[PDB]
Structures are given as structure tokens and as C-alpha cells.
PDB file of C-alpha atoms in Angstrom:
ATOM      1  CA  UNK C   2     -57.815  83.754  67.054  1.00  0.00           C
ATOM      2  CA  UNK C   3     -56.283  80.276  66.667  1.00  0.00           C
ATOM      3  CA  UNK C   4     -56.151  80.560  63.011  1.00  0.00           C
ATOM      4  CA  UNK C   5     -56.325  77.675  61.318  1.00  0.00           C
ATOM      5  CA  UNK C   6     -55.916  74.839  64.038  1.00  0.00           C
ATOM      6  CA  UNK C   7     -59.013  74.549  64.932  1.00  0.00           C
ATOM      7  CA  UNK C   8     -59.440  74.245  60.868  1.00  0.00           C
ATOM      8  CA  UNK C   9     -57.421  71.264  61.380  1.00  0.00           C
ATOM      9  CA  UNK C  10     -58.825  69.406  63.775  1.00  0.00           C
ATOM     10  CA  UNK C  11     -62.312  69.703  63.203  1.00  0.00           C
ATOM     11  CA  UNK C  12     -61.507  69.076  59.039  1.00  0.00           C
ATOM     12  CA  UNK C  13     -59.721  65.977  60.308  1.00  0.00           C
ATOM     13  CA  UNK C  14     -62.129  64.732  62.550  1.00  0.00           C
ATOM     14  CA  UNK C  15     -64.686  64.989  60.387  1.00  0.00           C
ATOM     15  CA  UNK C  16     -62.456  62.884  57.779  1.00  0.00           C
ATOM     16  CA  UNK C  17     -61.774  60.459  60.273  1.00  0.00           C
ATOM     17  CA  UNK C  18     -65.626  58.783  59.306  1.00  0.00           C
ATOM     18  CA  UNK C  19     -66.605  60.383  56.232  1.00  0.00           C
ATOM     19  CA  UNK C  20     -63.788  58.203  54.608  1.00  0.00           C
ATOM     20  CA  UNK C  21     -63.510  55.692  56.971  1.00  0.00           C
ATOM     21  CA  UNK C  22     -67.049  54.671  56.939  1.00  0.00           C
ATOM     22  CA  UNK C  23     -67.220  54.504  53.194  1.00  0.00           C
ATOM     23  CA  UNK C  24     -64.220  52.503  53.207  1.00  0.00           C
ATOM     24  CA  UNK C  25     -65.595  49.806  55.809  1.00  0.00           C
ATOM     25  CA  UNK C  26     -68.760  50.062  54.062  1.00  0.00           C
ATOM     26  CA  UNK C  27     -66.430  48.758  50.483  1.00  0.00           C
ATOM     27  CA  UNK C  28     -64.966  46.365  52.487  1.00  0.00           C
ATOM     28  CA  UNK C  29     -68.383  44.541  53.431  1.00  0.00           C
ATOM     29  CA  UNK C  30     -69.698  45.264  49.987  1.00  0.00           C
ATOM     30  CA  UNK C  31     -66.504  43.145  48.616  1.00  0.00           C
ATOM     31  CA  UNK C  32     -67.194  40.958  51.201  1.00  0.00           C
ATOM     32  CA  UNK C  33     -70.840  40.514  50.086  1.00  0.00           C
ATOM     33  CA  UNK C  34     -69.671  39.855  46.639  1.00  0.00           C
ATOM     34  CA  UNK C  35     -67.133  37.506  47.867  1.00  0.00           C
ATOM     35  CA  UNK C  36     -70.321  35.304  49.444  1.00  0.00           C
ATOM     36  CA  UNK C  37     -72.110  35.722  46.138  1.00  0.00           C
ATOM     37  CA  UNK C  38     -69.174  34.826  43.836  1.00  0.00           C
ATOM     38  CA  UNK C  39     -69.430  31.844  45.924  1.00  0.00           C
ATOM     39  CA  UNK C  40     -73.174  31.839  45.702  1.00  0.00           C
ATOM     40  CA  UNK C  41     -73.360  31.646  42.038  1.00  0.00           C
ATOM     41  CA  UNK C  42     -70.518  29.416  41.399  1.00  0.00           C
ATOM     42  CA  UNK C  43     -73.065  26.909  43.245  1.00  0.00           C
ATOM     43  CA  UNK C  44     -76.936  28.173  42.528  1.00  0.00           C
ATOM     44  CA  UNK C  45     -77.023  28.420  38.756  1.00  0.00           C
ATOM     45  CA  UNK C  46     -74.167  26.629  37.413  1.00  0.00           C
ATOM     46  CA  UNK C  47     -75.203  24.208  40.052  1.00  0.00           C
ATOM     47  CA  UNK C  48     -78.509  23.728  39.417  1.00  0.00           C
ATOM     48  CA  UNK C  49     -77.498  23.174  35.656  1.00  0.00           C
ATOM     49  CA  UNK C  50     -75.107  19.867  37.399  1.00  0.00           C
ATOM     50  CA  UNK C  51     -78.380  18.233  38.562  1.00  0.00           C
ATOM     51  CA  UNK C  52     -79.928  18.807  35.498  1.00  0.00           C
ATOM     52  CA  UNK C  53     -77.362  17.105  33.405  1.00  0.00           C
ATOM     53  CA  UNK C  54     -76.349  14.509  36.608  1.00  0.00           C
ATOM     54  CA  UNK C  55     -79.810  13.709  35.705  1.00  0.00           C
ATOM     55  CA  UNK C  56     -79.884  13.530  31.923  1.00  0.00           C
ATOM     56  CA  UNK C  57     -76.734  11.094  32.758  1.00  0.00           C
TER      57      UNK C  57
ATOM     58  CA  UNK K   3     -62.998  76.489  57.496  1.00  0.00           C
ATOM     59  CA  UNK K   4     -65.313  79.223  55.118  1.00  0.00           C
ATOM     60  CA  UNK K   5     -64.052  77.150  52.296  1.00  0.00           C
ATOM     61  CA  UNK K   6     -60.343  75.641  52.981  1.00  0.00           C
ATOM     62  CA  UNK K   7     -61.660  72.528  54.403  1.00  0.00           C
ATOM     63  CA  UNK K   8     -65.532  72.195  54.055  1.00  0.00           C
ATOM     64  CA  UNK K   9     -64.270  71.864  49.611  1.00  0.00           C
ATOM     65  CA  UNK K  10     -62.156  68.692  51.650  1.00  0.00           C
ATOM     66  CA  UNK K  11     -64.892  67.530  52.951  1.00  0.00           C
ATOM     67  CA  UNK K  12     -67.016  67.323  49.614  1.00  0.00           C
ATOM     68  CA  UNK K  13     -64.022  65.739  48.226  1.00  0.00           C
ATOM     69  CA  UNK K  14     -63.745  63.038  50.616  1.00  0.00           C
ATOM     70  CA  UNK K  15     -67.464  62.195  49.931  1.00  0.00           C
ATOM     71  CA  UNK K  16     -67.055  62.281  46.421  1.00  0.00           C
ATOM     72  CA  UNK K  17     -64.311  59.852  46.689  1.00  0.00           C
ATOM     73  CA  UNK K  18     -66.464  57.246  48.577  1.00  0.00           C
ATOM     74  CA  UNK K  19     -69.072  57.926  46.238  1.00  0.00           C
ATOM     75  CA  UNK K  20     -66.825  56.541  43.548  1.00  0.00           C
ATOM     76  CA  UNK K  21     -65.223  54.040  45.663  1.00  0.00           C
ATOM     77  CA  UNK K  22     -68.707  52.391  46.769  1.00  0.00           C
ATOM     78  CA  UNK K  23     -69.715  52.670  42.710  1.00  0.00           C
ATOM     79  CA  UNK K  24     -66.446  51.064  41.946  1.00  0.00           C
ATOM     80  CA  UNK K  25     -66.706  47.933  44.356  1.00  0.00           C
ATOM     81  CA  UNK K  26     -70.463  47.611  42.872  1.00  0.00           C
ATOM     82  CA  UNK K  27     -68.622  47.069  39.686  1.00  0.00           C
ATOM     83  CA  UNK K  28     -65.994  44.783  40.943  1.00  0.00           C
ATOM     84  CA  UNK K  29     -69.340  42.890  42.370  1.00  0.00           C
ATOM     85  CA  UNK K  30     -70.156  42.528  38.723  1.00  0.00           C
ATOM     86  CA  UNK K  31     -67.214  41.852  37.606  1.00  0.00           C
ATOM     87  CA  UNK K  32     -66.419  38.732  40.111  1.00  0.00           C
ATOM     88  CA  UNK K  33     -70.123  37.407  39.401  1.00  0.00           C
ATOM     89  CA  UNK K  34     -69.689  37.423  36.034  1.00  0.00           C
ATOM     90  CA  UNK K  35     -66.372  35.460  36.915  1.00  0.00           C
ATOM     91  CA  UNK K  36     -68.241  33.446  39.155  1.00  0.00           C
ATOM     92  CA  UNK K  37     -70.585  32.447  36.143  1.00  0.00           C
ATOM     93  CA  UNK K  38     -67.998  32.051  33.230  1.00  0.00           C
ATOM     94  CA  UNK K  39     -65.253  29.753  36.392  1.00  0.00           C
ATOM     95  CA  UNK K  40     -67.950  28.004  37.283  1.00  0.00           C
ATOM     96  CA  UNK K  41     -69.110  27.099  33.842  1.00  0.00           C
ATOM     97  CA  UNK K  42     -65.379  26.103  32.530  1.00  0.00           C
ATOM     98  CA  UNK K  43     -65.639  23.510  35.687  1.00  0.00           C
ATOM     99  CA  UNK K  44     -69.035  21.894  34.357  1.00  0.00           C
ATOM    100  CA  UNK K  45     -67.435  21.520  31.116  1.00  0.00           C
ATOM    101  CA  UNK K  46     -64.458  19.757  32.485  1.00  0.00           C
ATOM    102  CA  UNK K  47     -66.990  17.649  34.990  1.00  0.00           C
ATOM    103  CA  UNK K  48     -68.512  16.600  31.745  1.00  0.00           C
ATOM    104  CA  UNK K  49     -65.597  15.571  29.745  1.00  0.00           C
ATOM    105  CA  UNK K  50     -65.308  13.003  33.178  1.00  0.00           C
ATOM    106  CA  UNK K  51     -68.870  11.880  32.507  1.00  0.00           C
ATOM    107  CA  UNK K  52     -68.507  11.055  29.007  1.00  0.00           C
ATOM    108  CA  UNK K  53     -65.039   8.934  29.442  1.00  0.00           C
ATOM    109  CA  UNK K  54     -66.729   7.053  32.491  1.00  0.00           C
ATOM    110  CA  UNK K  55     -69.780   6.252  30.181  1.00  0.00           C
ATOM    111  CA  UNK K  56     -67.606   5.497  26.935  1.00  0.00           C
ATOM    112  CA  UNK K  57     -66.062   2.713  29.754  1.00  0.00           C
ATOM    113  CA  UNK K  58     -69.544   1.676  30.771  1.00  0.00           C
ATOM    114  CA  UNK K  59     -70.662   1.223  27.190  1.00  0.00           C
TER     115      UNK K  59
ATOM    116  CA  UNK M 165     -90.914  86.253  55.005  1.00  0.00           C
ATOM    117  CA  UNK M 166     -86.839  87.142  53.633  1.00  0.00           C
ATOM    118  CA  UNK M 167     -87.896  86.402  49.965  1.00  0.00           C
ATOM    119  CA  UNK M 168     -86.160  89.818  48.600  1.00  0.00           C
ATOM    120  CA  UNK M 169     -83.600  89.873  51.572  1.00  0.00           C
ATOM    121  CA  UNK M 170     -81.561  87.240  51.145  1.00  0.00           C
ATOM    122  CA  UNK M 171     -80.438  84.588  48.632  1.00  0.00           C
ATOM    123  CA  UNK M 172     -80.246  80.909  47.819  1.00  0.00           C
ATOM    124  CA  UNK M 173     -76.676  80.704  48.919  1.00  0.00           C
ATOM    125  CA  UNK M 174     -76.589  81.872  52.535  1.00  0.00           C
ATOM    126  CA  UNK M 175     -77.067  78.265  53.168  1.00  0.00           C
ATOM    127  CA  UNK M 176     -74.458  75.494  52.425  1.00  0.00           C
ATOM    128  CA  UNK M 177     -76.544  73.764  49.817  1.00  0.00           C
ATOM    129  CA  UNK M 178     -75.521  70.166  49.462  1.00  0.00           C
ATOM    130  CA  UNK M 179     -75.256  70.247  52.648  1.00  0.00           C
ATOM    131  CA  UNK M 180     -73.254  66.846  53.776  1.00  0.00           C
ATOM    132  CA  UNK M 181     -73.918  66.581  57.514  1.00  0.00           C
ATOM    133  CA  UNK M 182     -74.847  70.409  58.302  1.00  0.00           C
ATOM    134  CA  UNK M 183     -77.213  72.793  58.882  1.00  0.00           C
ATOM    135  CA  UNK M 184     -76.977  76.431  58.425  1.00  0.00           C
ATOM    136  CA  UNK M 185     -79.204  77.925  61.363  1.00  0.00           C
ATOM    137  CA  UNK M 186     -80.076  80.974  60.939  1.00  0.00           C
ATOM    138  CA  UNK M 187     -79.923  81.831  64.603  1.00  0.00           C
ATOM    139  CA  UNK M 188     -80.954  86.131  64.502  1.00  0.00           C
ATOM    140  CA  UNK M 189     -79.221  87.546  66.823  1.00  0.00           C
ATOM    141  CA  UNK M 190     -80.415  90.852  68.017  1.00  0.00           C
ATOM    142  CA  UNK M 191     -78.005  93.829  67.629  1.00  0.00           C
ATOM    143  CA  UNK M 192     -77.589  94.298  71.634  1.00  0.00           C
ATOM    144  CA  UNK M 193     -75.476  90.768  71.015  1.00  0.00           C
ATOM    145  CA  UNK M 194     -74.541  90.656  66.886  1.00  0.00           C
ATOM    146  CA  UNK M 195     -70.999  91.517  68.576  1.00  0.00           C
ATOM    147  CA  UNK M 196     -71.282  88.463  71.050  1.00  0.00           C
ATOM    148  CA  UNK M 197     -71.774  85.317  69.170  1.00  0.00           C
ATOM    149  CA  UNK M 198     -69.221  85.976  66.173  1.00  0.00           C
ATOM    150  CA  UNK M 199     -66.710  85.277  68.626  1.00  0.00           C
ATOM    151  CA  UNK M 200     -68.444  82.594  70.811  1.00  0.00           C
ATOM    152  CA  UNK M 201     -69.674  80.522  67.360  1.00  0.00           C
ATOM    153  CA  UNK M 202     -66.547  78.661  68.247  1.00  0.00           C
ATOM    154  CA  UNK M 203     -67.374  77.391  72.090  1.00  0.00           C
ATOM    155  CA  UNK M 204     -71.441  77.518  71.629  1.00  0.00           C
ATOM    156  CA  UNK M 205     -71.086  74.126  69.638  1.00  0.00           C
ATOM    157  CA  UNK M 206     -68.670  71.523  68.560  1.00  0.00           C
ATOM    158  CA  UNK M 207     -68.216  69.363  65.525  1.00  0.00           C
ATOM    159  CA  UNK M 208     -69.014  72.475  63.654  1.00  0.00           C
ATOM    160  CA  UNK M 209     -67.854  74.717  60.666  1.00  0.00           C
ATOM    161  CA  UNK M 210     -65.300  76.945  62.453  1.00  0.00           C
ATOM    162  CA  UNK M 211     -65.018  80.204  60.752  1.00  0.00           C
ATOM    163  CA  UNK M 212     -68.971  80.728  60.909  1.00  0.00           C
ATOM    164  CA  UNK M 213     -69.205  84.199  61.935  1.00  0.00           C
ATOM    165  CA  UNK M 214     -70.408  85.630  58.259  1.00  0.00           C
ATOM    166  CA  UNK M 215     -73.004  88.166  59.180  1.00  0.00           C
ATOM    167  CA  UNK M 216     -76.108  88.340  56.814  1.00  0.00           C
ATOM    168  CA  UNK M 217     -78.045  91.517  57.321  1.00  0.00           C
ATOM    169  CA  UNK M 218     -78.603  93.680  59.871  1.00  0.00           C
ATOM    170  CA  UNK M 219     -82.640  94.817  60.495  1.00  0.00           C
ATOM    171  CA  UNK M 220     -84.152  97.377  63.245  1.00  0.00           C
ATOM    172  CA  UNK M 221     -85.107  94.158  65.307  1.00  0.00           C
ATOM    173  CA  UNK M 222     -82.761  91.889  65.336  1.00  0.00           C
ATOM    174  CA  UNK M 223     -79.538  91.449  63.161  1.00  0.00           C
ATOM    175  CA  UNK M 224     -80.396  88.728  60.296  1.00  0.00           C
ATOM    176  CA  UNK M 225     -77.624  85.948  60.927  1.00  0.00           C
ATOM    177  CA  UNK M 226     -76.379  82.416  60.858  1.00  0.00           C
ATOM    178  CA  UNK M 227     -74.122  79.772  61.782  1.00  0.00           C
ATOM    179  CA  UNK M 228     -73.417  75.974  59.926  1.00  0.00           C
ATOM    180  CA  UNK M 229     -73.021  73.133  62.732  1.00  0.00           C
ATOM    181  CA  UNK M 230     -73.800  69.218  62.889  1.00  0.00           C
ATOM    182  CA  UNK M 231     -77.482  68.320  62.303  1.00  0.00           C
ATOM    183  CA  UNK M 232     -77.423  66.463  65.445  1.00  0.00           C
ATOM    184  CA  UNK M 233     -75.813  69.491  66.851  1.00  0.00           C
ATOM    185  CA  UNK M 234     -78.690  71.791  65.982  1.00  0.00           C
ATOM    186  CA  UNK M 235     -80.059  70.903  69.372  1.00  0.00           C
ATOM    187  CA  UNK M 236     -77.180  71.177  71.468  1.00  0.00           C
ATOM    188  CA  UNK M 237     -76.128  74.738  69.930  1.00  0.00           C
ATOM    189  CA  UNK M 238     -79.644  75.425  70.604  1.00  0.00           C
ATOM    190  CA  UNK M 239     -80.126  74.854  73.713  1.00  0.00           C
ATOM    191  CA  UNK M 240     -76.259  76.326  74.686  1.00  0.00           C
ATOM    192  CA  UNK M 241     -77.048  79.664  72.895  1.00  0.00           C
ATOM    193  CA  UNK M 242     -80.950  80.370  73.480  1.00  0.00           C
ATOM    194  CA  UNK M 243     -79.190  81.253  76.995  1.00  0.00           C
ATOM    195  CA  UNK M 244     -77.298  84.135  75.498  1.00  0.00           C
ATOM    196  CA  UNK M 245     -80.052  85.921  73.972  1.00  0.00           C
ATOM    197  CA  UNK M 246     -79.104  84.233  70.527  1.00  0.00           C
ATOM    198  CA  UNK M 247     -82.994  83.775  69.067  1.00  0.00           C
ATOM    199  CA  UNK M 248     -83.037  80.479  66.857  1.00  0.00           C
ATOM    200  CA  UNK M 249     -85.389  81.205  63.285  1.00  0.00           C
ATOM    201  CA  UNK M 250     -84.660  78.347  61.016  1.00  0.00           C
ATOM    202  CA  UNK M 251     -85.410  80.193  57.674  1.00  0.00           C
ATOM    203  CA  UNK M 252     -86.009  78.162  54.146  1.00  0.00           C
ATOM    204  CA  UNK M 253     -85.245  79.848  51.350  1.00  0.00           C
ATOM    205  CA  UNK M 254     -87.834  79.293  48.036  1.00  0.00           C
ATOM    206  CA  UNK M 255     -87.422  81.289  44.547  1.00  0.00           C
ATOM    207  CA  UNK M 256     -90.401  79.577  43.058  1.00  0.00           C
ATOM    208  CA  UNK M 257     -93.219  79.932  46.090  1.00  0.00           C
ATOM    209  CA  UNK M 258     -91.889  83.712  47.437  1.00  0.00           C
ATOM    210  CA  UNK M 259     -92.421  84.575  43.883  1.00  0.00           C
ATOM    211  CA  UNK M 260     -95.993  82.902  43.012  1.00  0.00           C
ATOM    212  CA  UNK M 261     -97.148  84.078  46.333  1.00  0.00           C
ATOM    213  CA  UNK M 262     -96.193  87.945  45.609  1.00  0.00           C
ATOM    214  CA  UNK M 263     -97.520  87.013  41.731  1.00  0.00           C
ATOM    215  CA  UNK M 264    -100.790  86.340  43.382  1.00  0.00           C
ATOM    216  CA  UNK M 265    -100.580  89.250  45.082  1.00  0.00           C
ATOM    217  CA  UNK M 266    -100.450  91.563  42.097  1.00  0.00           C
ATOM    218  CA  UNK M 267    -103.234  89.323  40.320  1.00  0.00           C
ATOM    219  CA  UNK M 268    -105.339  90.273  43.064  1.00  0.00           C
ATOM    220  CA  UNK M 269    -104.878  93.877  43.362  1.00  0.00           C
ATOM    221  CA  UNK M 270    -105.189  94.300  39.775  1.00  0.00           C
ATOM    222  CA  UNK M 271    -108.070  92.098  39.095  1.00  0.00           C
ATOM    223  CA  UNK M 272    -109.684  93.789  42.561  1.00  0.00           C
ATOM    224  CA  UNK M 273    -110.063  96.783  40.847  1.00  0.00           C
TER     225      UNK M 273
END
């Protein structure tokens, strides 16, 4: 009947959150990492400048 | 869609398949950079400690 | 059971948010829902109108739709005399069952 519109638009719409739900989903994962490249620039290596602080 | 746009759809999955792998290794990659920035710093911070304690002795 | 009927693929194996209910249709409305496939449900597989079988009952069939739209095609096209039969397909258990079978009939006499 309509061929391949309705193809089309139900393809798309389904695109429309398979991608764009894995996409926001990368975004909060980089985001996550962005806390924990912050995080361990001040938990480990940190901990290691009040163990020397205190050897000074 | 027999098979014109449900292949698409297994594409489009596949690629955030990769995409979610691929900022899980970008994760590792900036802690890693975390680790080896952060370290550099604490070197520098004590090069500062040693001059101030040369001027103390 | 449809264990030498039909075959693994009549499904959409790996599936990623579908179903393929097989929804047997009898043959006084096979005609009926490979046109209405399209209106019975939305955020579906269009295209869906790929017959299986046909059988003295009712005509063996199918149709691929949203998993969360199992219910509403359900409930839409139970109205229609479209009878819903949500058949799994197994290689391994259809065939140990019908080894059994043998085992016994040989090992009854």
C-alpha cells in the first residue's frame, strides 16, 4: 500500500532512541569518568601527599 | 521493513555497542592520565619541599 | 507441539526490542490480518504479513511488534478473531522428547 513510508517512519522513530539513548548514556559515562579523573587525581596520589607531608 | 530497515536497526545498536565500549576505554585512558598528571604534580610539590628544607637547614 | 513444522528462524532471533507473536489466525480470517498487521499495532515491524503454514484448524502465522506492544496488539486483535499462541521453538528438547519416545516403544517391546 504505502510502500515504503511507513518503512520510514517507523525505522526512524525507532532510531530516534536506539542511538540517542546510547549516546546520552556515553555522555554520562564521560561524565562519570570526568568525576573520577578528578577522583583519583586526589584519592591515591593524594593520600601518597599526606604520607610524605608527614615523612616531612 | 522485512529486512531494509530492521538490518538499520541492528546497525544502530551495534554502533552504541562500540560507542559505550569505546568511552569505557577513554575512562581508562583519562584515569590512567589522572594517575601519571597527578603524579608529575607530587614530584614538582616535592622539588618545593626539598628547597624550603635546604633553607631551613 | 510445531517441532517438525516450523524452524528456528520464523522468529527474529536477536531480537532487539521485538517479539514475533505467533498470533494463528484461522483460515475464515488468514486474508484479514495481512492487511490490518499495519493498524492492529504501532511501533511495529511494518511489512509483517509473512504467512507460515496453513493447517485444517487454523492457519499457522505471525507478526513481530514492540514487547511492550505484545499487549496492546493483543488485546486490539483477539477482537477480530486473530487467536494469540506464543510458540517457542527448541531443536534440542522437541528432539530428546521424540528420542524418548522411540526408546520407549522399542524397549516396550
Amino acid at each position: 500500500a504505502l510502500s515504503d513510508a511507513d518503512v520510514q517512519k517507523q525505522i526512524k522513530h525507532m532510531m530516534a532512541f536506539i542511538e540517542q539513548e546510547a549516546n546520552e548514556k556515553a555522555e554520562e559515562i564521560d561524565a562519570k569518568a570526568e568525576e573520577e579523573f578528578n577522583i583519583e587525581k586526589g584519592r591515591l596520589v593524594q593520600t601518597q601527599r599526606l604520607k610524605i607531608m608527614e615523612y616531612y | 521493513s522485512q529486512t531494509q530497515g530492521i538490518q538499520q536497526l541492528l546497525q544502530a545498536e551495534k554502533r552504541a555497542a562500540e560507542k559505550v565500549a569505546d568511552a569505557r576505554k577513554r575512562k581508562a585512558r583519562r584515569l590512567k592520565q589522572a594517575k601519571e598528571e597527578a603524579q608529575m604534580e607530587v614530584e614538582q610539590y616535592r622539588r618545593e619541599r626539598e628547597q624550603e628544607f635546604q633553607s631551613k637547614q | 507441539s510445531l517441532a517438525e513444522i516450523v524452524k528456528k528462524d520464523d522468529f527474529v532471533l536477536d531480537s532487539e526490542y521485538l517479539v514475533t507473536l505467533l498470533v494463528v489466525v484461522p483460515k475464515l480470517n488468514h486474508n484479514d490480518w495481512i492487511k490490518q498487521y499495519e493498524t492492529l499495532a504501532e511501533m511495529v515491524v511494518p511489512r509483517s504479513s509473512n504467512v507460515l503454514s496453513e493447517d485444517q484448524d487454523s492457519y499457522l502465522c505471525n507478526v513481530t511488534l514492540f514487547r511492550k506492544a505484545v499487549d496492546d496488539f493483543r488485546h486490539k486483535a483477539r477482537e477480530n478473531k486473530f487467536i494469540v499462541r506464543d510458540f517457542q521453538y527448541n531443536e534440542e528438547e522437541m528432539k530428546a522428547d521424540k528420542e524418548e519416545m522411540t526408546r520407549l516403544s522399542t524397549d516396550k517391546k
